[PDB]
Amino acid sequence: VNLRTQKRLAASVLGCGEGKVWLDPNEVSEISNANSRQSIRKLVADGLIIKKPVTMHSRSRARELNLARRIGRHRGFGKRKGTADARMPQQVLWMRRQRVLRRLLVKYRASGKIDKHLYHELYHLAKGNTFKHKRALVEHIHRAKAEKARERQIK
């Protein structure tokens, strides 16, 4: 008995590949009598034809390695294969830093901590790479404020 047609029809009805189709090996003649999609659906309802579940592909090891890399493992010189710029672009780092500094300067000017002249000067210093990060820019702003306060107290 040949059941190629029944396997193809059952794959089409179940919406899976033919490798996921299970035909009952004890009901071979009854399945062989099924020549229509209606008969295939009837056999699927009776359980003579079932769809096998998918083969396992778990992500547990990948998630465990991700947690280990997040806490800082497997980051050594024996694990790096690309260049430092290939791993982390200096252009991306500079763009992030410039956006952080400009965002902070906009916030300070809008809140009134700095005025517009100091904003312009700090903008061009930040573009000219004076400040390594937000903390350095904030300390520079505080030092400039202290110098201005001392000048106002002296004058």
Partner: protein, 49 residues
């Protein structure tokens, strides 16, 4: 003067509140017409006549 982020967020919250109020008022108008449905049907039939 230049407005701050808090003022901009307040303006945005006001606009969203206005839109929500308009939607609720439209729903209540629809409910009132649903209460007055029979008179509305009588008026439509009279206009057709």
């Amino acid at each position: 003067r230049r407005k701050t982020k808090a003022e901009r967020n307040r303006i945005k919250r006001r606009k969203e509140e206005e839109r929500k109020r308009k939607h609720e008022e439209a729903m209540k108008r629809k409910q009132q017409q649903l209460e007055q449905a029979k008179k509305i049907a009588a008026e439509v039939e009279e206009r057709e006549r």
